[PDB]
Structure formats: C-alpha cells, structure tokens
Homo-oligomer: A and B are copies of this chain.
Amino acid sequence: AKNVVLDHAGNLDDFVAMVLLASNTEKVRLIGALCTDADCFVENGFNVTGKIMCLMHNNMNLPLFPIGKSAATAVNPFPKEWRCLAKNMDDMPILNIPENVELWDKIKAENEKYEGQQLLADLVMNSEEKVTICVTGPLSNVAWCIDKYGEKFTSKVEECVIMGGAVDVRGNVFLPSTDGTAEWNIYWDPASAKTVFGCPGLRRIMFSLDSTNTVPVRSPYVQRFGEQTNFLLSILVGTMWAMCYAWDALTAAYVVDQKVANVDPVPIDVVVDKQPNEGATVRTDAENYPLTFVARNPEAEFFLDMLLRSARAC
C-alpha cells in the first residue's frame, strides 16, 4: 500500500474518489484528506468526508486519518448551482447511522484543528515513504504547499494525480465570460494550477476532461449498486452517482491501479489571465517546461468494475 492524501472539493465524485481510495486498503493507505470549500461549503464537504470515513472505519479495516478543512478561497467560485451537494450527502441516511455519527462527533474536534493546506504539507513531508496526492478539487492546496515549501514538499510527493484541465478537448466552464476552454477545478484557482503544472520535480498525473469524458455516469451501471445494497458503500456510491462523469472517481481509480489509464507527457501551462479562457490548461512549447502525464483512453470497464467491487468493501 502506498500513502495517499485526498485533496478534494467535496462534490459527489470527490466522495466516490474517496470511497475508491479508502476501500482499496491493499493498494492505498489513505493517510489524510483535505476538503476545499470549492464544490461545496468546506463545512459539509469536511463533514461528509468524516462521515464517510467513520462509516468505513466502523465497517472495514480503514484506519482513521486526519481530515482538514482547507483555507483556500476561490479565484472563481464553482457554480452555486451544483457545488454544495455535500450538504445533501451530509443528510443521507447512509452517512447518519448512529454508530458512525457517534464516532465522527468524537473525532471531529481533533480534525477541526487542522488547517487543510498545512495538513497536506505535513502529511506529505512527514511521511516516511513518499505520498501520492490524489487531487480531485482545485490545485490551490498543492500549490500552497509548493509556494511555501518548494522542494522540501515536492520531493516527498510520489506523484500528484490530478483531476483537472482539458488539454485536447473542450473544457466545461461555460459562463458568459468564458469560452468554454477551461475545466472547473483549474478555473477555480488558475494561479495555483499554474504553480502545480509548471512545478519541475513534481510528478503529475493528469486526469483532464480528455480522459474523464470517455467514462460517463450511465444509469444501468449506477443501478448495479442496487445489486449490492447489503453493502454500505454501494448504497453510498449508488446514491451519490444517482444525483445531479466519473471525473474524480477515475482519478482516484488510477491511484488504486495505474492500469486505469496510460499516460502521455505534455507540458501543461495554465492561463491565469482574467481572459475568456482563464483556467485553460494549454500545451506549452516553452523549452524544458515540466512534463505532466495526461491520462489517455482510460479503461472504462476496468474502472467501472473496480468501483463496483470496491463498493463491496463494506
């Protein structure tokens, strides 16, 4: 098992990624998670992270891990539209089974004392072995760590598996002020993304929309979790995916098993200018620019099977 820290934005797929990571203890040792008040009010995201962790901890061999609320603030907020859906998960019956909430309530205080970014920095730097950061939300936190600790931080990162950007496909940020070339996580904080993608000595695996677009949330598959209602994770996963792509889940799946996707190096830069394409992750020919390993043609079935099986961990 390799150390993994989940740096997420608290949206539905962030939690599916969390489930994926957490449930695969053979491959992943989830030593921490941080939630950014991005796709949600860090509040609900933080709580759901904890409720999921506790549900898992009380039902399978998943060690408790610190959970930090990131202090990162958006450059460009996620649409209020979806965004705060963690609020809705916070209230799902599956995440409010008494023994689990009882645990969360007991360990909540210890977690409330963490500042997400510093926790990310500490978890990575103080780990004996290198840490794989699964970033399913904006890059504000990994960027903060780099800005603050440079190499002391990046050298301790096995690799940063990032869900974000759109390299050779359209983005998904369609607003009156944008040209749709940017992807949401990058668009949330382009500057931090620039820092991360341009950081040499930081191995980055990038699950841009190029790969995530090829593995959409399909009804028949989601209904298969109904075949596993005896498993809490299936009720959990099935329920989340049954709400308004497996972006983050795909990203986390890779962390569990890189067979999820081949990756090809691409020098990725980010447009941080308040321009229509703000947040666009673009190929750059600038010499010696750091390479990012963009996932390509993910193994949809492999991933879909992985998720279904992982959803049986408990």
Copies in the complex: 2
In the bound complex, CA of A139 to CA of B226 (Å): 34
Contact A226 B84 (CB under 8 A): no
Convert A281-295 into 0s and 1s, putting 1 for each residue whose CB lies closer than 8 angstroms to a CB of B.
000000000000000
A228 vs B239: C-alpha distance in the bound complex, in angstroms? 17
Question: In the complex, which residues of chain B have a beta carbon less than 8 angstroms from the beta carbon of A219?
Answer: 90-91
Q: Interface centre among A82, A234, A241, A242, by most B CB within 10 Å? A: A242
Q: Interface size bucket, A side?
A: 20 to 34
Interface majority SS (helix, strand, loop, mixed), chain A: helix
* The residue from B82, B88, B101, B234 contacting A93, defined by CB atoms under 8 A apart: B234
A60: CB under 8 A from chain B? no
Cβ–Cβ contact B227 & A92, under 8 A: no
The answer to whether B235 and A96 have CB atoms under 8 Å apart is: no
A239 near B90 with CB under 8 A, answer no
Q: Which residues of A contact B (CB under 8 A)?
A: 82, 84, 88-98, 101, 219, 222-229, 234-235, 238-239, 241-244
Q: List 14 A-B contacts (CB under 8 A).
A: A90-B242, A91-B242, A92-B242, A93-B228, A94-B229, A94-B235, A96-B226, A96-B227, A96-B238, A97-B227, A98-B226, A101-B223, A235-B235, A239-B239
